[PDB]
Symmetry: C5
Amino acid sequence: QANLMRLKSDLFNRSPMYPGPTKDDPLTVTLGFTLQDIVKVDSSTNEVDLVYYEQQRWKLNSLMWDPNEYGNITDFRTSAADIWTPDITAYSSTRPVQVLSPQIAVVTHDGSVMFIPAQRLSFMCDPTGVDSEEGVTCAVKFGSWVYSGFEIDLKTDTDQVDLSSYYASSKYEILSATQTRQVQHYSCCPEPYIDVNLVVKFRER
Amino acid sequence: QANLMRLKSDLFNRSPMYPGPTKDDPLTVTLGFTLQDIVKVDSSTNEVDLVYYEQQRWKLNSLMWDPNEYGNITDFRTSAADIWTPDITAYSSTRPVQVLSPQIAVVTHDGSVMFIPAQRLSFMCDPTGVDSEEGVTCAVKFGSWVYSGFEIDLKTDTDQVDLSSYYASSKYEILSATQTRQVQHYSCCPEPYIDVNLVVKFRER
Amino acid sequence: QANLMRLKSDLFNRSPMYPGPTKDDPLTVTLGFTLQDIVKVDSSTNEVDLVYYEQQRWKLNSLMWDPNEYGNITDFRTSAADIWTPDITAYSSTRPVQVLSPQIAVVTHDGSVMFIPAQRLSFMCDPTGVDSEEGVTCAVKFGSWVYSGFEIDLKTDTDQVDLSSYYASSKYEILSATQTRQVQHYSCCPEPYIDVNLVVKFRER
Amino acid sequence: QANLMRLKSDLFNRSPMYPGPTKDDPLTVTLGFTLQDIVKVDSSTNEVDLVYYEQQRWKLNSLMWDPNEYGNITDFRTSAADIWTPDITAYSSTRPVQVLSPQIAVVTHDGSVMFIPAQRLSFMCDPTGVDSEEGVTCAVKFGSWVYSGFEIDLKTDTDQVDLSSYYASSKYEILSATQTRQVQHYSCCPEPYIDVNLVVKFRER
Amino acid sequence: QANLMRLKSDLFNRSPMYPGPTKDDPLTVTLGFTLQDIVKVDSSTNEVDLVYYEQQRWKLNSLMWDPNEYGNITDFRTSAADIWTPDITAYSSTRPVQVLSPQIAVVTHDGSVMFIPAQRLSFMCDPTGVDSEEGVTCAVKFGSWVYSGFEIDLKTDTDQVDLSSYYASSKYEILSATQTRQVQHYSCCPEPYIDVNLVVKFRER
Ligand SMILES: C[N+]1(C)[C@@H]2CC[C@H]1C[C@H](OC1c3ccccc3CCc3ccccc31)C2
């Protein structure tokens, strides 16, 4: 602990916080979903509720250190409030997202940060058909709220949503779940926007 | 980031916060709504739930900078807690407004601030009739809570509410949505009050 | 803003906060209600929900200033957390009060403070009869929770609750609404106890 | 206010906070309940909701002063966060306790503290029979969560729960309410444990 | 109190907080559950609510002291915010956990910390069958959210969940309740994660 205390002190107290990316200085955030459960479906409001882990990865120069200088410490855990985090948001939620997990990130010597909040999300989705055999399809985009693709580049490692943790006895079985990077384009504005479209196909039972 | 850190430092640490407008020193706030979804109607309580983005714009001299002096930075993003924000409020909500988006603002070198929170709002509205053609109409005024028109002047760029992001599969289709600036007077009160009246006409299906 | 910043600095940063009234040094708070809507009734728990504005006024010597010394500023707005506020509470609520408005007060050069929070309140009342023509009476008292009438004297400008903003299409029409100052005593104790009794008579439709 | 500011300063800023009682240095806390309302019973979960005021009294040497040295001030009010408070807890709640009143205490020159939070509490309780003639009896203990009877001695002034404020039109009439100090010995532990057992007998109507 | 104040000062003010364990410096946390009540099931959403005490024990060198140097004080109580706590989390909750008890820990001279928060948890569980005699079996996993088994080793004293406080009149009787230590080797990674699998078999009545 002697060493880790010093490391944390050097990174967080001697330095101002990282002010977020700029166009001259962009950042890549890697996003990945582990879909845990579809909890609730509401025919009368068209909200559906998901529980998932949202994996977030990025890398900052200002978070790098030589392990040799800190008793061979390769990585540590720290409160998410101690560091900058990206403003990744569901574009079509209907309630504030509920955080199910401690807000703690893992920081590695190479400057990598990994942050994996578990969340319950209510979002817009017409479940009409979910009792049929062919099921229904819903979609929610995740993106930075205020950063364009010039400042924050979104990325996935795979378009397969991780289903290895899906609640086996959920009221709803998952037929397919994909996470797809998209580049929104508008004649409002001569610059791109990046989101990840979480598309879930599911049915009852 | 070298430059942005210094810029934020110069603006926010060396200076006291902006103390809000005065009558000798008023401020114009521009308001605009992007209506996302009418989520829920409650006929027994006459309450209706909206999800929308509320675009807010204003301009402060104390937030200006010459880009040349900060590595050609034209704008940045910052926590809304870092700056003064107007106290725009729904005049007839029945529950505290739920914030759906990160509280982050965009500040431009000319001193412009842009803040676009996503919100869910329950407000007073008698939905009786919504199951027809011709549908039902509901209104809600948004205004400063404590500043008169002498201190804060409200404005819109257009009386058309932005409907380009309305949930196509909402339980409710929008017939029309306007945002209209009103000045009120009141027997009690020498000074003018300004609001923007959000009027939405909608029906089921 | 040059002057207001100085004024706020002089009042709030050079001075300790006001520590609340004492018996040798009492305070008068003026209370008034603007009743906005009766939202819901629950005949199964006997709770009713009101939305109202609660007008609070009091005056502190420590909040006075000569406008001439601060560029003719007569009054300003500030976060309620910057100043002492009285602990006015509903004596018979069943849920924590929900705050519907920004917590901002108006301070005037004469030492007056005006604070007008919008609130939603669930309180004990038995609505049995509300479907009749002659309606039903509910009452809730509000006073200080911890100050006796030796320290805080409550007062109203009028016993008429302001009904000029009542939701015209509420499920409940208001037959009468009064706000009445009351002094009780307790055996054990010389000190008088003050409250304002909000009595509301209402019926369906 | 001149004197009170100084008194508060002397007690709270020049001194560390009181660290809580020890076995060599125990503390008596006096508890009393004012039962305001039984809001609901839930027969499908065995939860029952109470609204009450829980009077708490204790006495600390470190909170004493000679009134003569502070302009004859006998007592003052202060935020409960300014002082140590005992960790009195319902042993069988099913939801976090909801605070209904400002968190302010009254401190007297003799070192007495009085703290009276109003709360809504959902506890365990099988209401089966509450519609019958004799109705039912639920109980909930209150006691320190982490201090044994060697550190915190609980006490009541009376075993009668104060019913003088019970909502006359509650859905439930109170047949009897007692508060009884229990010295419990657990077979895990050599220390004695105290609690106050709030026993309420009630029925419908 | 003279001595305790000094002890707390020496431990918490002169020293930085404990920065959490590292692989070169791991920590054992001992977990144990006291199951208090199964409160509610929702066969519609497949969620189940438990109330339990979660006993947590660990030991830190930095929390040791010689009782002789502090007036023979063997142990003390302190706010859990004053010390590091492990990030033990339910892996399959569907709502944020509700804390029912004061957040206070007991620290012993040997460096032991004991922390026993009472909680209400809604987690994923298909109750279909609970009305039979055989009953239904449900399972929830608890463990660190961000520390691998290289940093935090979980342990139980017993695989028997403590049932000596179970609500005798709960809607649900407990047929069996076990807490079992597991080693899991999830998706991405070469490093184990440790969990305690809380398995509860129950039925109505
Ligand atoms: C809101 N209160 C706290 C105000 C008015 C109703 C309720 C109860 C009352 O407090 C009294 C009281 C009177 C004299 C000295 C101390 C106290 C506080 C304890 C207490 C306990 C039971 C009933 C009344 C009071 C004052």
